[PDB]
Amino acid sequence: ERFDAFICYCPSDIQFVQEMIRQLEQTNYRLKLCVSDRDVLPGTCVWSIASELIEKRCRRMVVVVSDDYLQSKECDFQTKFALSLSPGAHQKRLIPIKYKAMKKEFPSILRFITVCDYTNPCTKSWFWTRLAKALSLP
């Protein structure tokens, strides 16, 4: 009915989505993440159910950015639809995440929003803390 965040990801990054479920849902943060392969019911229009969840049934949206993420078209529609809700990031709704080594360019439409970097070994301690705090604010 009401989720804390929608998780935009390609099938190749589903392994890190499991970590996002263990670290945020099964811990003391008690966040309510929306995973399409788990919570989206079959028979729904992939564009209409994404437009209905991201805009009304999810406060924010997490984007797992990787090289395989760029090749995904469904993630492309969800990412651009998320920016359309607040271009300029006034509401802090679009939270991109980099967990893997990317040999391609970061999405140019997301180059002006803070990214939660998981690959930097000097800031791994604050990764889940900053992520769970952003999804917890109203």
Author numbering: 159 to 296
Q: Please, what does the article write about this entry?
A:
MyD88 and MAL are Toll-like receptor (TLR) adaptors that signal to induce pro-inflammatory cytokine production. We previously observed that the TIR domain of MAL (MALTIR) forms filaments in vitro and induces formation of crystalline higher-order assemblies of the MyD88 TIR domain (MyD88TIR).
By using a micro-focused beam (nominally 1 × 1 µm full width at half maximum (FWHM)), and optimizing crystal concentration (7.5 × 108 crystals/ml), high-quality diffraction patterns from individual crystals were collected. Minor differences in some side-chain conformations can be observed, which is most likely due to the flexibility of certain regions resulting in poorly defined electron density or as a result of the difference in the data collection temperature. The lattice parameters derived from the SFX data were found to be slightly larger than in the MicroED data collected under cryo-conditions. Our room-temperature SFX data also showed a slight increase in lattice parameters along the a-axis, when compared to the cryogenic MicroED data, indicating the lattice change is related to the temperature difference between the two data sets. In our investigation, only subtle differences were observed between the MicroED and SFX structures, which may be explained by the differences in the data resolution and completeness, flexibility of certain regions, and difference between cryogenic and room temperature data collection.
